[PDB]
Design a protein around this ligand. Structure first.
Ligand SMILES: [Zn+2]
Ligand SMILES: [Zn+2]
Ligand SMILES: [Zn+2]
Length: 79
């Protein structure tokens, strides 16, 4: 169970700045590192954000759901 990388790369992404600071949270759950100013993040439809590289790795290689709340992505297709 994994997602096509070309699909994962269309997910919304943003930079960790003062504006995104208190919407995205403080720490990436995938690597446990606190976000630093200027880092690249991605947002999942379940409203959890991660390091862009971290969630891309998870969705393309390891799983098909959010690693925090297990919200499944693309259970059924075409539809
Ligand atoms: Zn903070
Ligand atoms: Zn991370
Ligand atoms: Zn989630």
């Amino acid at each position: 169970s994994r997602l096509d990388a070309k699909l994962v790369h269309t997910l919304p992404c943003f930079t960790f700045t003062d504006s995104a600071h208190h919407k995205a949270g403080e720490t990436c759950a995938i690597c446990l590192e606190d976000y630093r100013f200027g880092e690249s993040l991605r947002l999942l439809p379940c409203q959890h954000a991660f390091h862009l590289n971290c969630i891309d790795s998870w969705l393309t290689k390891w799983g098909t759901s959010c690693p925090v709340c297990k919200h499944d992505i693309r259970t059924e297709t075409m539809s």
